[PDB]
Design a protein around this ligand. Structure first.
Ligand SMILES: Nc1ncnc2c1ncn2[C@@H]1O[C@H](COP(=O)(O)OP(=O)(O)NP(=O)(O)O)[C@@H](O)[C@H]1O
Ligand SMILES: [Mg+2]
Lengths: 334, 96
């Protein structure tokens, strides 16, 4: 394919650092400037929740689905490249490149695999998500909710497993974010599909001289050398070691809910609910908190993890800057 | 059957607790009245009954159907609703 006690010592020693969460996040995509919250959310998608199966009452998904939405030139697609190369298994694809059959499975009498099936247990990166038709996007409802694919065609009828995490990229209606429309109307996905993402990010091309000088200095510094040694930050982890950390934590660590975490989750859900938050906001909060716990090599979910899960959800969709009654965003607060 | 969110704190506070319990304990939360292998044996037994419509029930059915027709006078209520109501009553008697 393309362990030792020293590796365990290194992993345990790194896990004791105070700046661990920021260190890991800024190290998944070293040359990309800022976008810290986006990097953090992607890191938690890499770790994932915990998988659960009951004797009866079913099984519950550990995987996280993320949507990146906003202005052009904001470097969304560049981030999808890093995720596609970091993940052990996965696929990158485009909206105009995909059919309903190609995305799931194909009759040929034999059955054949599509992208979401090849990507099982990994991450499936979908770019230009706003270009594919309502017919093709309707296929994703069942696979995202259940993590299974049911088929019933001439001579073949069966169900297949798809433990696949989706990372999506799109631009708003009108192709540049319009502040005179509410956020849900700018995003323009129908509610049954928009309800299935754990995190939704707004990223905006806001002009600012302070930001622009730093961005310009960062991009122009890459052309001072033939094959650059330069990198955005002094301390980042090598890709190999980072992969080792993530892989080990996925295999050995399995956090559980503490009573304290249960009380905070109930309180937080009632807070978002009483005023719109659906029942899926609760489950996605649980899943994000579990992902945060694995990343610290803990066996228990605690109050700190729940509060981080809540904070990241509020930060992603620019809620603090949102008018609570009209649903428009004040661009001055960004 | 039409399902609606109907947001209410007194329901949300309980529903959230139920959901968090399912993620906190795997098997323990549900505590059903019967075992599945018990329930299937009961359902197999029940389907052997072939109940018969009582005289008073025949008199009562036309009154209830007239009430539905006057409510109707929304999908328009046809003779098929009476036939369906008879089916449901057969199933209810069989359940008992
Ligand atoms: N913060 C940033 N860090 C690094 N490169 C950036 C940044 N912002 C913009 N760029 C550069 O600007 C370009 C962005 O291209 P791209 O990744 O396609 O952005 P995008 O969000 O996908 N825009 P679009 O495809 O039009 O919706 C690339 O050359 C990036 O290197
Ligand atoms: Mg792009």
């Amino acid at each position: 394919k393309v362990i030792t006690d020293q590796d365990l010592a290194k992993i345990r020693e790194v896990a004791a650092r105070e700046d661990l969460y920021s260190l890991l996040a800024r190290s998944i995509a070293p040359s990309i400037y800022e976008l810290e919250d986006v990097k953090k959310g992607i890191l938690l998608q890499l770790f994932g929740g915990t998988n659960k199966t009951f004797t009866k009452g079913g099984r519950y998904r550990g995987d996280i689905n993320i949507l990146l939405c906003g202005d052009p030139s904001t470097s969304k697609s560049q981030i999808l490249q890093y995720v596609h190369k970091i993940t052990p298994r996965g696929v990158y694809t485009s909206g105009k490149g995909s059919s309903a059959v190609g995305l799931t499975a194909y009759i040929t009498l034999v059955l054949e695999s599509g992208a979401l099936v090849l990507s099982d247990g990994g991450v499936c990166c979908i770019d230009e998500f706003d270009k594919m038709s309502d017919s093709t996007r309707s296929v994703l409802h069942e696979v995202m909710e259940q993590q299974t694919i049911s088929i019933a065609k001439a001579g073949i009828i069966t169900t297949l497993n798809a433990r696949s995490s989706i990372l999506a990229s799109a631009n708003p209606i009108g192709s540049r974010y319009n502040p005179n429309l509410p956020v849900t109307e700018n995003i323009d996905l129908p509610p049954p599909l928009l309800s299935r993402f754990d995190l939704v990010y707004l990223v905006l091309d806001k002009v600012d001289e302070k930001n622009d000088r730093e961005l310009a200095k960062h991009l122009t510094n890459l052309y001072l050398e033939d094959k650059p040694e330069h990198i955005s930050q002094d301390d980042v982890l090598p890709v190999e070691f980072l992969t080792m950390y993530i892989s080990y934590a996925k295999e050995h660590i399995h956090p559980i809910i503490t009573e304290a975490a249960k009380t905070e989750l109930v309180r937080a859900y009632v807070g978002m609910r009483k005023m719109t938050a659906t029942t899926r906001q609760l489950e996605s909060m649980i899943r994000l908190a579990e992902a945060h716990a694995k990343m610290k090599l803990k066996n228990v979910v605690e109050l700190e993890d729940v509060q981080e899960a809540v904070r990241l959800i509020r930060s992603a969709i620019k809620d603090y800057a949102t008018d609570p009654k009209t649903g428009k965003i004040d661009m001055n607060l960004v | 059957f039409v399902i609606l969110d109907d947001c209410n704190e007194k329901i949300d506070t309980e529903l959230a607790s139920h959901i968090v319990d399912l993620h906190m304990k795997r098997d323990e939360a549900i505590e059903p009245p019967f075992s599945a292998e018990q329930l299937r044996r009961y359902i197999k037994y029940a389907r052997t009954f072939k109940p018969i419509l009582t005289k008073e029930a025949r008199s009562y059915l036309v009154e209830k159907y007239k009430e539905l027709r006057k409510d109707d006078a929304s999908y328009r209520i046809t003779v098929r609703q009476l036939e369906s109501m008879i089916r449901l009553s057969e199933a209810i008697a069989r359940a008992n």
